[PDB]
Design an enzyme around this catalytic site. Structure first.
Site, PDB file in Angstrom:
ATOM      1  N   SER B 104       0.845  -1.176   0.000  1.00 30.39           N
ATOM      2  CA  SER B 104       0.000   0.000   0.000  1.00 30.39           C
ATOM      3  C   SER B 104       0.890   1.239   0.000  1.00 30.39           C
ATOM      4  CB  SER B 104      -0.868   0.019   1.262  1.00 30.39           C
ATOM      5  OG  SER B 104      -1.890  -0.909   1.143  1.00 30.39           O
ATOM      6  N   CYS B 105       0.539   2.246  -0.807  1.00 26.98           N
ATOM      7  CA  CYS B 105       1.192   3.563  -0.815  1.00 26.98           C
ATOM      8  C   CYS B 105       0.150   4.645  -0.599  1.00 26.98           C
ATOM      9  CB  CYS B 105       1.868   3.826  -2.167  1.00 26.98           C
ATOM     10  SG  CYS B 105       2.884   2.431  -2.814  1.00 26.98           S
ATOM     11  N   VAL B 106       0.347   5.488   0.424  1.00 29.07           N
ATOM     12  CA  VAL B 106      -0.524   6.659   0.638  1.00 29.07           C
ATOM     13  C   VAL B 106       0.319   7.900   0.915  1.00 29.07           C
ATOM     14  CG1 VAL B 106      -2.382   5.142   1.570  1.00 29.07           C
ATOM     15  CG2 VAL B 106      -0.878   6.416   3.105  1.00 29.07           C
TER      16      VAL B 106
END
Lengths: 137, 125, 138
Positions: B104-106
């Protein structure tokens, strides 16, 4: 209020944690799930369970309530604060992390959980802090 | 049971956390930040240099656990600016091999000590 | 490549890759999901149409649906399902919109519902409004 529902996948089970000592899970989530020897909590928020409302005060008061709620979910799962292996601390203000840390340090001792800490842009109900945990049973 | 990673090859855990916890066949790292373990300071430069340091810290944490980068199953990459994603990815790709971890990338508002990137990993042992 | 033959070995445990053309292709250094032991770890699913490779048309309801269909199809390709999800993290661009997200989400899960964390972040990949990762069992 019932915790008798489960799901089965082969030899493993998904079991629900429900406790009235923490804010009720309204809608499509559970306060925590037990599967194998793992406990996965929801991200706890500083709602006082005897009112349904966010607690009065500031970050110090919210941080305390989050951790009490986390404690009671964990213990209701058959786990405990000292069996937490990993937390994520989501906060509204990184600049006052020392204050969150000072409260957090009262709820854990060696061996401390692994942790990630990030400043988010908003949290449910405008709260200043949210903490989820992975723990063992 | 529970085991605590305490390696001098990554920044010391000061305060109520651990570099990583080992429980059975699983390793949970802390969210690693671009701190130079030798100076205790953020490394100089921009996103490329910080991404490297984070992944070097991650590598050393994982190896001290008896794991490694090639046994990582899941990462979360928190970045200060989503526009530098392609730079992060280029550095990131040097450190992992197929089958690559889930990810996941945020983009977040702020990170500890004003860093530009923080990365946590779940790994096996 | 659509092959799922590559693994990593760690003693008696294995990291196995999940690939399905029913969800957006993992391009670059990540996998749609990973299977290890009896656990499935998904990537953070985003509202890309696996057919077009683009963010779906519409608004939050449409993006919520697409993310959850993507997660469905990833899980199912792993031999898992939505019914076997134990934990989600829901990253959204707009906490004020969360009831609408919740309304869609509720259609994809059954009791006992996954544990969940919901936070608003400042940005997501491609400016999407929602991203959801899951941990499931097989």
């Amino acid at each position: 209020q019932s915790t008798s529902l489960y799901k089965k996948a082969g030899l493993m089970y998904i079991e629900v944690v429900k406790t009235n000592k923490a804010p009720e899970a309204i809608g499509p989530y559970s306060q925590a799930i037990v599967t194998g020897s793992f406990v996965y909590t929801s991200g706890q928020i500083p709602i006082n369970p005897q009112t349904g409302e966010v607690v009065d005060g500031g970050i110090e008061e919210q941080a305390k309530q989050v951790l009490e709620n986390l404690k009671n979910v964990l213990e209701a799962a058959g786990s405990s604060l000292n069996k937490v292996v990993k937390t994520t601390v989501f906060i509204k203000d990184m600049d006052s992390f020392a204050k969150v840390n000072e409260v957090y340090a009262k709820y854990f001792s060696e061996p401390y959980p692994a942790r990630s800490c990030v400043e988010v842009s908003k949290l449910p109900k405008g709260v200043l802090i949210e903490i989820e945990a992975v723990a063992i049973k």
